[PDB]
Amino acid sequence: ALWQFRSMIKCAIPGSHPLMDFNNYGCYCGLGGSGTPVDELDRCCETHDNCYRDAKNLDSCKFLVDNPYTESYSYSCSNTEITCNSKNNACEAFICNCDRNAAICFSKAPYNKEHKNLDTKKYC
Ligand SMILES: CCCCCCCCOS(=O)(=O)[O-]
Ligand SMILES: [Ca+2]
Ligand SMILES: [Cl-]
């Protein structure tokens, strides 16, 4: 679930402001996205959007009727270490990892204020 995603990011990147920070960033961090990613971070989101694309096409998520951001799952945090609990079932585990990997990715990609609120129509 999205709330869990924001929570997950706040775990891997402490003083973070997930939504303020990762929405409308680059050409992929946000609703949808196209064009060439603008940097390592924008790439993290491209990967995340593909992971969510596979998720819906996953047999294990056949009963999930909406966007993966509505799929709730089970994760824990410890020392900015994100764990996807084994109690998660197929679809959840999967979606949990799309998120986890994204948080980790986000925490290791440079952040360039210039790529925030980028003009998509003009550069994507
Ligand atoms: C352009 C941003 C769209 C998504 C905004 C946040 C939607 C979810 O809000 S939440 O259910 O408390 O995690
Ligand atoms: Ca996106
Ligand atoms: Cl995204």
PDB file of N, CA and C and ligand atoms in Angstrom, residues 1-6 19 23-24 30-31 69, ligand 1:
ATOM      1  N   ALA A   1       0.857  -1.208   0.000  1.00  0.00           N
ATOM      2  CA  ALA A   1       0.000   0.000   0.000  1.00  0.00           C
ATOM      3  C   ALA A   1       0.878   1.238   0.000  1.00  0.00           C
ATOM      4  N   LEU A   2       0.422   2.277  -0.682  1.00  0.00           N
ATOM      5  CA  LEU A   2       1.192   3.504  -0.767  1.00  0.00           C
ATOM      6  C   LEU A   2       1.649   4.031   0.595  1.00  0.00           C
ATOM      7  N   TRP A   3       0.729   4.180   1.547  1.00  0.00           N
ATOM      8  CA  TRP A   3       1.104   4.674   2.875  1.00  0.00           C
ATOM      9  C   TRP A   3       2.296   3.885   3.393  1.00  0.00           C
ATOM     10  N   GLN A   4       2.280   2.578   3.159  1.00  0.00           N
ATOM     11  CA  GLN A   4       3.362   1.707   3.588  1.00  0.00           C
ATOM     12  C   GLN A   4       4.630   2.013   2.804  1.00  0.00           C
ATOM     13  N   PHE A   5       4.462   2.418   1.553  1.00  0.00           N
ATOM     14  CA  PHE A   5       5.592   2.758   0.705  1.00  0.00           C
ATOM     15  C   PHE A   5       6.242   4.021   1.266  1.00  0.00           C
ATOM     16  N   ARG A   6       5.435   5.029   1.584  1.00  0.00           N
ATOM     17  CA  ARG A   6       5.986   6.266   2.120  1.00  0.00           C
ATOM     18  C   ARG A   6       6.692   5.949   3.424  1.00  0.00           C
ATOM     19  N   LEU A  19       6.382  11.964  -0.277  1.00  0.00           N
ATOM     20  CA  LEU A  19       5.544  12.596  -1.274  1.00  0.00           C
ATOM     21  C   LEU A  19       6.151  13.899  -1.793  1.00  0.00           C
ATOM     22  N   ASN A  23       7.488  12.907  -5.699  1.00  0.00           N
ATOM     23  CA  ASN A  23       6.383  12.999  -6.625  1.00  0.00           C
ATOM     24  C   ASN A  23       6.739  14.102  -7.603  1.00  0.00           C
ATOM     25  N   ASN A  24       6.330  13.954  -8.852  1.00  0.00           N
ATOM     26  CA  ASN A  24       6.626  14.968  -9.845  1.00  0.00           C
ATOM     27  C   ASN A  24       8.116  15.185  -9.998  1.00  0.00           C
ATOM     28  N   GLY A  30       6.151   9.482 -10.232  1.00  0.00           N
ATOM     29  CA  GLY A  30       4.847  10.101 -10.142  1.00  0.00           C
ATOM     30  C   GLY A  30       3.861   9.264 -10.933  1.00  0.00           C
ATOM     31  N   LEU A  31       2.658   9.786 -11.124  1.00  0.00           N
ATOM     32  CA  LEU A  31       1.639   9.071 -11.873  1.00  0.00           C
ATOM     33  C   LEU A  31       2.104   8.835 -13.310  1.00  0.00           C
ATOM     34  N   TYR A  69      -0.882   0.049  -5.462  1.00  0.00           N
ATOM     35  CA  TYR A  69      -0.788   0.983  -4.345  1.00  0.00           C
ATOM     36  C   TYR A  69      -1.931   0.777  -3.369  1.00  0.00           C
TER      37      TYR A  69
HETATM   38  C1  LIG B   1      -0.087  12.981  -7.530  1.00  0.00           C
HETATM   39  C2  LIG B   1      -0.023  12.197  -6.224  1.00  0.00           C
HETATM   40  C3  LIG B   1      -1.116  11.132  -6.219  1.00  0.00           C
HETATM   41  C4  LIG B   1      -1.101  10.307  -4.926  1.00  0.00           C
HETATM   42  C5  LIG B   1      -1.339  11.164  -3.659  1.00  0.00           C
HETATM   43  C6  LIG B   1      -1.318  10.259  -2.416  1.00  0.00           C
HETATM   44  C7  LIG B   1      -2.434   9.206  -2.509  1.00  0.00           C
HETATM   45  C8  LIG B   1      -2.415   8.253  -1.323  1.00  0.00           C
HETATM   46  O1  LIG B   1      -2.606   8.882  -0.091  1.00  0.00           O
HETATM   47  S1  LIG B   1      -2.525   7.674   1.101  1.00  0.00           S
HETATM   48  O2  LIG B   1      -3.730   6.524   0.808  1.00  0.00           O
HETATM   49  O3  LIG B   1      -2.761   8.360   2.636  1.00  0.00           O
HETATM   50  O4  LIG B   1      -1.010   6.929   1.044  1.00  0.00           O
END
